[PDB]
Amino acid sequence: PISPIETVPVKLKPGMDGPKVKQWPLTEEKIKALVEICTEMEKEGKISKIGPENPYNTPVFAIKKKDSTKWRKLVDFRELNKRTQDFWEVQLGIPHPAGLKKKKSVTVLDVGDAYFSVPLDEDFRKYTAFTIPSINNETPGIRYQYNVLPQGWKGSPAIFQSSMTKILEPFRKQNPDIVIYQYMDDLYVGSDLEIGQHRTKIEELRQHLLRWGLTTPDKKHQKEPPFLWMGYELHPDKWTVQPIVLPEKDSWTVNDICKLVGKLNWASQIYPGIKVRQLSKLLRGTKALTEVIPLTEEAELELAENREILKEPVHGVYYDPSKDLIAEIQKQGQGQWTYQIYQEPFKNLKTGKYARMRGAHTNDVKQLTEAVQKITTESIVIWGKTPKFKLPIQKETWETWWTEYWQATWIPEWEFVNTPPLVKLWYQLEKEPIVGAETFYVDGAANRETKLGKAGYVTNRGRQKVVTLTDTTNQKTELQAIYLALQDSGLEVNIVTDSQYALGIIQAQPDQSESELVNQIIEQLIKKEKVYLAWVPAHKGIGGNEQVDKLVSAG
Amino acid sequence: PIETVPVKLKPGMDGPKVKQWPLTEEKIKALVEICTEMEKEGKISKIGPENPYNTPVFAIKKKDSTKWRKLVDFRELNKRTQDFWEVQLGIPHPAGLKKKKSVTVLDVGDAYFSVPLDEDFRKYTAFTIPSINNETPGIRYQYNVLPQGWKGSPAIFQSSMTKILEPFRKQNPDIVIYQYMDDLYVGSDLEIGQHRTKIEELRQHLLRWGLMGYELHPDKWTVQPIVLPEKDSWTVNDIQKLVGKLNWASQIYPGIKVRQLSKLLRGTKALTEVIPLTEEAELELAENREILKEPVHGVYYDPSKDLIAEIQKQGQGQWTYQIYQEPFKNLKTGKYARMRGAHTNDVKQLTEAVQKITTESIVIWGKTPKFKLPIQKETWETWWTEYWQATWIPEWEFVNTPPLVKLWYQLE
DNA sequence: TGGTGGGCGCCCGAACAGGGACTG
DNA sequence: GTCCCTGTTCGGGCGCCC
Numbered sequence A: 001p002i003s004p005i006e007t008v009p010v011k012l013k014p015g016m017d018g019p020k021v022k023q024w025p026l027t028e029e030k031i032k033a034l035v036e037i038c039t040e041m042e043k044e045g046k047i048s049k050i051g052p053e054n055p056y057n058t059p060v061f062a063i064k065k066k067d068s069t070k071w072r073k074l075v076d077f078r079e080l081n082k083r084t085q086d087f088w089e090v091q092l093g094i095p096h097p098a099g100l101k102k103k104k105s106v107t108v109l110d111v112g113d114a115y116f117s118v119p120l121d122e123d124f125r126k127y128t129a130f131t132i133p134s135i136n137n138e139t140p141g142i143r144y145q146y147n148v149l150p151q152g153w154k155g156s157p158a159i160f161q162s163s164m165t166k167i168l169e170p171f172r173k174q175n176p177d178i179v180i181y182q183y184m185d186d187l188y189v190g191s192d193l194e195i196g197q198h199r200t201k202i203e204e205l206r207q208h209l210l211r212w213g214l215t216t217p218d219k220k221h222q223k224e225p226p227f228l229w230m231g232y233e234l235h236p237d238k239w240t241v242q243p244i245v246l247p248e249k250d251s252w253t254v255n256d257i258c259k260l261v262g263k264l265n266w267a268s269q270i271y272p273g274i275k276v277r278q279l280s281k282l283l284r285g286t287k288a289l290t291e292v293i294p295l296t297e298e299a300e301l302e303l304a305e306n307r308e309i310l311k312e313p314v315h316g317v318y319y320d321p322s323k324d325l326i327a328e329i330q331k332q333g334q335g336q337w338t339y340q341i342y343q344e345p346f347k348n349l350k351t352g353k354y355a356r357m358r359g360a361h362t363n364d365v366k367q368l369t370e371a372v373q374k375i376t377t378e379s380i381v382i383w384g385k386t387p388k389f390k391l392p393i394q395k396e397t398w399e400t401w402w403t404e405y406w407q408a409t410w411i412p413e414w415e416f417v418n419t420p421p422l423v424k425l426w427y428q429l430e431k432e433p434i435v436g437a438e439t440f441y442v443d444g445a446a447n448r449e450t451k452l453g454k455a456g457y458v459t460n461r462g463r464q465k466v467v468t469l470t471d472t473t474n475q476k477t478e479l480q481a482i483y484l485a486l487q488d489s490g491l492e493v494n495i496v497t498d499s500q501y502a503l504g505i506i507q508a509q510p511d512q513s514e515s516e517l518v519n520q521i522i523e524q525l526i527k528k529e530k531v532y533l534a535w536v537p538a539h540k541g542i543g544g545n546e547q548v549d550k551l552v553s554a555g
Numbered sequence B: 001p002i003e004t005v006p007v008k009l010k011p012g013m014d015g016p017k018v019k020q021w022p023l024t025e026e027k028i029k030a031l032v033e034i035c036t037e038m039e040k041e042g043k044i045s046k047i048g049p050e051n052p053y054n055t056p057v058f059a060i061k062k063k064d065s066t067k068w069r070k071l072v073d074f075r076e077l078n079k080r081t082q083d084f085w086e087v088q089l090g091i092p093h094p095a096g097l098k099k100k101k102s103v104t105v106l107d108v109g110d111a112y113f114s115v116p117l118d119e120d121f122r123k124y125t126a127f128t129i130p131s132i133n134n135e136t137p138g139i140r141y142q143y144n145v146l147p148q149g150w151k152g153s154p155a156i157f158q159s160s161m162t163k164i165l166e167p168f169r170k171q172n173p174d175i176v177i178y179q180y181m182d183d184l185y186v187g188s189d190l191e192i193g194q195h196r197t198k199i200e201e202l203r204q205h206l207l208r209w210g211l212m213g214y215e216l217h218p219d220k221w222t223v224q225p226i227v228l229p230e231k232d233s234w235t236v237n238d239i240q241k242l243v244g245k246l247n248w249a250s251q252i253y254p255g256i257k258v259r260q261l262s263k264l265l266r267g268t269k270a271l272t273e274v275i276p277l278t279e280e281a282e283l284e285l286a287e288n289r290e291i292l293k294e295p296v297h298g299v300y301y302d303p304s305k306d307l308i309a310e311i312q313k314q315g316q317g318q319w320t321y322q323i324y325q326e327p328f329k330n331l332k333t334g335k336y337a338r339m340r341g342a343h344t345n346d347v348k349q350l351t352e353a354v355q356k357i358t359t360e361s362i363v364i365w366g367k368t369p370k371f372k373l374p375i376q377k378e379t380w381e382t383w384w385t386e387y388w389q390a391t392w393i394p395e396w397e398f399v400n401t402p403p404l405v406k407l408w409y410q411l412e
Numbered sequence C: 001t002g003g004t005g006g007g008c009g010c011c012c013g014a015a016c017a018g019g020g021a022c023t024g
Numbered sequence D: 001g002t003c004c005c006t007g008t009t010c011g012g013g014c015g016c017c018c
């Protein structure tokens, strides 16, 4: 049947016209599929034979469906889509099992030929013109247009999703306490009703759907835990992901890799420990999806680590709104982080990994603050509240950082967990100049023309060093100079720089950086017992900044 | 039986297309209740995906309360809406309001629903209510009346607002009533007590057509001047900081000179060496310290240009701010103080700081400043709404501020 | 076997967007 | 103005859902 629902008005973008793009060569097996599909659709009013009054046309083909018995008729509207107006998508995100609550009774329903059950705007139908190439001595042959939503058009998903919401509103209003998770044409229906009253309620849902033109075949998941839903399988008391199988290719290529990450990431929603740093790094400047490349002793190593964790069995549980949410985070390497979220001690609601690099320079405390952020926003989407945190970081370490850091930073209600590795600051700049520590006035200049440079220092104790660099920059020569001063100073040292750039990087207490120069500086800083970085405005004759400046300015 | 007044976008600009952000359960529950109610009242309508526009919505729980206020973030639509503002308003700004002993702020949002919105403009006021765990696709509405928080709402309703206020202003001439967006600002020099009595009395006239806080005392606001440290001995370090501070400050007050001080530092000295200040250095330090007293000369508020606010975290609950339109040309420099406790929430504190500062800006220039927030974007956007209490929302941007400017404005 | 759509996620590279420092 | 350096946005590919 076709839904009696009102259409959604649809325009092409101004000034543009409909697609005139002729069919391409189609297989025999699929033309058999396509005409059998079409002649039935056309019996049902879902499409209409058009005539030569219709200028337009768009290619069509056919792939299989999940069971692999049925065919799906797609239309390549790539051209029409470009020409079609913009929409606002109403699918804001993806429901998650860990956010489901325990219900007494569960049903999973699917709608039949879903799209082909929603009317397409009448004024727009003529742009959906396609043509079935038929066996070549028995017709050119047949030309149709859509009276319902096509699969390949840019607007179908959103118009379906909106049309469904419209259709379910009356039922939802009438049944405020039956929960219907609505994903495209997928329905999960839960109730606190007993099996037989639930059943009656489900049939009412189906009559309601069918009054609006939506059928529900079976495909009706019934007294049938485990339910198959959204790529999961839900049992009364636990949920798990349908099996994941990572490739085993021995020559790996970009495309092979990119889908190794994919499934791993996907995997990490409930397999704790997954990491993909090394793997993702393989995939840098590789300008081609085909390019192969050896898994670094580091990567090939990492791949085998996850590959081991997937072997163990694991489920998540469902959500009790009356217990608290707890996120526990643990640290890995290369700015990689894992977390688990639960309400009861060893019963994961779900899990995940954070592992972005925000910034050229940074440290653990920042990266931890960022994983906290991520998890918080994720919880608000899934459970609509914020979790309590268990973090591998001492209340003291936090307070120190938040007292030193010039930005507003904050972590929700949280509590320390002795689980190593603990998050620490690897050094601390002094607040006051250090008595009995040699004072270094550093500076570097660079010749923007030649790219040639000089970094160097002068110290109150009479030492002075100047290093010519080649192929450099002011900021580099200036970082280089701090690096010279640390190199040649004792365990305690005062350094005076004129560079905000440098002072800014170092002040913020990085422990990792994209820059090897800064990495070396960091090794130096962690080795030292006391360091005090002071700043002064440059070219002001202040000493002995004036001294170093004259000295590194041989260019 | 009222007629709709046409309204348009600026030329060459299209309506907002801003994605809805995740909302907590408590907020979504409130929005769904407010909106069902506004739908009954015909004040908003459900719409489809074929409307291409979107503007975020959330909700706030004002004071200790069980009453929520829908808050649509329109500053993108406002940025884009016809210059209604600098064209269709005969509005000077009440210079006296900033002097008034006590100002009270009233939320005359309801008053706007009493006017319909140009059908052709409705499209642009669309928003989208999220569901928890995406159990549903978003539910989308567009406005039918004047939207709260929209730039065009006080403008279109200006005259009707004047009619209602008019009689109240006539009987109370020394009461100054100013309007900004959903806000009525009401100041007087009445003894606290008579003032509220009088305010309850304006709200009595306001119930007559149909159908918040806290309490402002503007003339107690004040400026945080730049200030120099006073020491009985100075170290090379002490003086190196001092020269840097002054040198930068000279960009603000061109009277500041740093030469005699800069020459106590000749040579290559240890930072902790003590240098006794020479007569000149000593005197010159006294000049500067006074020069800083003097008011910043040559600063003129230009309404066409936008107000910039910078904020620096000073630590221990202190926050400093400046409001300028051109660099070093401050209109107001201030500090915000708050609890020095252990459980301080920086982000809460930052957003209370931006609300205070925004509030002062409205009262003093009747305009909203563009803030430069010393916080990471994601951190800020994770929590700021859990602390908001205003009915407006200032533009902003996030910045990595130099550990220099934080010390330039530091206190003692 | 090819070839379609929308959503979210993850990475990575592109293009910007700023500020700060330079030249003579 | 020019360099730098850093941040952001956007798009592309892959995963998963329908």
Ligand SMILES: Nc1ncnc2c1ncn2[C@@H]1O[C@H](OCP(=O)(O)OP(=O)(O)OP(=O)(O)O)C=C1F
Pocket: A065, A070, A074, A110, A111, A112, A113, A114, A115, A150, A151, A152, A184, A185, C004, C005, D018
């Ligand atoms: N590869 C894709 N390309 C474009 N669009 C796609 C694709 N895969 C899904 N879709 C959209 O999801 C919808 O799928 C609905 P289901 O898959 O349950 O099938 P049915 O036709 O409604 O009926 P049945 O249940 O009776 O078989 C229809 C769409 F077009």
Ligand SMILES: [Mg+2]
Pocket: A110, A111, A112, A113, A114, A185
């Ligand atoms: Mg189906």
Ligand SMILES: [Mg+2]
Pocket: A443, A444, A445, A478, A498, A499, A538
């Ligand atoms: Mg220098």
